[PDB]
Ligand binder design. Structure first.
Ligand SMILES: *[C@@H]1O[C@H](CO)[C@@H](O)[C@H](O)[C@H]1NC(C)=O
Ligand SMILES: *[C@@H]1O[C@H](CO)[C@@H](O)[C@H](O)[C@H]1NC(C)=O
Lengths: 441, 52
């Protein structure tokens, strides 16, 4: 048999159903989703790091003047300073007064820290989504399997076919431009190759970690070596990595909505609790059992013994059952009004057992099916007196949950009063319209 | 090796959480809702402060 459903893309909440293929006992299905791995296809655009400016040795040609070519180097400068009198230890280093050459070659290249740290910039695409799922059916124990989230992939979890249809919403935390740094990512636009703004982010732009081309753009300028001391004084803007670290934004993982955590080595956002998932699970037929074998259960009476609409299962109730023979039953409420803690109850004759449940409505009306039977029970729940707790919401709230059955009475009597007053008017207009107009005649 | 700021003194009121913080060193506190709107909040705390 095939069972299809839909499920909250929630991370700790189990999803409980009963498959019902007729003529067999209902069989209890549990799906638990333990991570949500949304894997975006990415391409590394360029990497970046602190620059380092290598100033090769200057050329000091004494009398006369050399000229220097534009050798291909990132952000290369070479300027000849005429009128130099470089004055070293043990003599000045040149025999001319003026008309001497100080060539002042400067050149900028990737620092060695780039090997260990680098804010590599990607370009995010739609990619694929997958998840690790945990199933429990019948008396078979827990069976876990990773699964591609797309309808077109069998993903055989054990002995059953699980097809997980494409995620209801296509939201992704990542925009098209992302930059990964260390253990985190940033939803930052990056001035891409060769558009480097000369001082904020893209001072260096290296196509890969070990690339021979480097689009330095750092606004290197060279100055006159003062007072005849040999050196190549170079003035230029500080590193873009400096200012990007200082004025770094909040990391995406600290801003990503829907409780989305981020991991790195696939650049994946986990535990991303958006929308819902369709499910289509084709269970083995062998796990079923003929209804004629199944016990009859009858004269069911369930009473809520104490409930309080807490997140955790803060309602206890009791069901008095009478039985045909020893055996197992699944108990789940077919409707979202309650979630039942207990998967299965394996049951003797003529007895009264207790089940825990969680709910937020202030008069729950669960219709709970024990062993292909039915029983409906309701009662008051009270506010569970803690304010903030750390257990996520086991139940799903619906709008018609908070109305306290006097407020329900109050709005009912109010709406009835308006409607009946207008109806009284309508009847009065009709009866005067006829008794007084047409009967006098 | 990094430092651990003293664990915040935490106490609850109705739908609000109130952290008394006593940073010995300047400390970064980030908060983010897990709903549709992240509503991030990121501030550095130098002196002992309370925050709601
Ligand atoms: C499946 O759920 C059970 C519930 O106790 C848990 O012990 C088990 O670790 C889960 N599977 C995986 C792969 O974590
Ligand atoms: C909320 O913050 C304000 C401003 O700092 C403060 O006056 C107030 O005491 C805080 N809340 C509580 C419950 O104290």
């Amino acid at each position: 048999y095939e069972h299809t459903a839909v499920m909250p893309n929630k991370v700790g909440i189990p999803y409980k159903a009963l498959v019902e293929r007729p003529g067999y006992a209902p069989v209890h299905l549990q799906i638990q989703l333990v991570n949500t791995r949304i894997i975006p296809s990415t391409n590394l655009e360029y990497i970046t790091c602190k620059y380092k400016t290598k100033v090769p040795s200057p050329v000091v040609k004494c009398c006369g003047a050399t000229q220097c070519t534009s050798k291909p180097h990132p952000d290369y400068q070479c300027q000849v300073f005429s009128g130099v009198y470089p004055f070293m230890w043990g003599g000045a280093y040149c025999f001319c007064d003026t008309e001497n050459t100080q060539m002042s070659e400067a050149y900028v290249e990737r620092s060695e820290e780039c090997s260990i740290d680098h804010a590599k910039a990607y370009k995010v695409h739609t990619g694929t989504v997958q998840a690790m799922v945990n199933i429990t059916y019948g008396s078979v124990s827990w069976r876990s399997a990773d699964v591609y989230v797309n309808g077109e992939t069998p993903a055989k979890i054990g002995d059953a076919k699980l097809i997980i249809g494409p995620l209801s919403s296509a939201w992704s935390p990542f925009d098209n431009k992302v930059v990964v740094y260390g253990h985190e990512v940033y939803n930052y636009d990056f001035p891409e190759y060769g558009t480097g703004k000369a001082g904020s982010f893209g001072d260096l732009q290296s196509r890969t970690s070990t690339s021979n081309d480097l689009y330095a753009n750092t606004n290197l300028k060279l100055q006159r070596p003062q007072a005849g001391i040999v050196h190549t004084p170079f003035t230029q803007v500080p590193s873009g990595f400096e200012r990007w670290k200082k004025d770094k934004g909040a990391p995406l993982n600290d801003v990503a909505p829907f409780g989305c955590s981020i991991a790195l080595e696939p650049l994946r956002a986990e535990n991303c609790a958006v929308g819902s998932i369709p499910i289509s699970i084709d269970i083995p037929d062998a796990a079923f059992t003929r209804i004629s074998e199944t016990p009859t259960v009858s004269d069911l009476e369930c009473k809520i013994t104490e409930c309080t609409y807490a997140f955790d299962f803060g309602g206890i109730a009791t069901v008095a059952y009478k039985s045909s023979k020893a055996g197992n039953c699944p108990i789940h409420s077919p409707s979202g009004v309650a979630v039942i803690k207990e998967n299965d109850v394996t049951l003797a004759e003529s007895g009264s057992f207790t089940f825990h449940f969680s709910t937020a409505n202030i008069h729950p009306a669960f219709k709970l099916q024990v062993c292909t039977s039915a029983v409906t029970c309701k009662g008051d729940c009270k506010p569970p007196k803690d304010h903030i707790v750390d257990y996520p919401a086991q139940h799903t709230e619906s709008f018609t949950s908070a109305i306290s059955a006097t407020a329900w009475s109050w709005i009912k009597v109010l709406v009835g009063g308006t409607s009946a007053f207008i109806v009284l008017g309508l009847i009065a207009t009709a009866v005067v319209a006829l008794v007084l107009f047409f009967h006098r005649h | 090796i990094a430092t651990l700021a003293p664990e915040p003194l935490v106490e609850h009121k109705h739908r609000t959480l109130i952290l008394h913080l006593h940073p010995d060193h300047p400390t970064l506190l980030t908060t983010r809702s897990l709903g549709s709107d992240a509503n991030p909040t990121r501030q550095w705390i130098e002196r002992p402060t309370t925050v709601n």
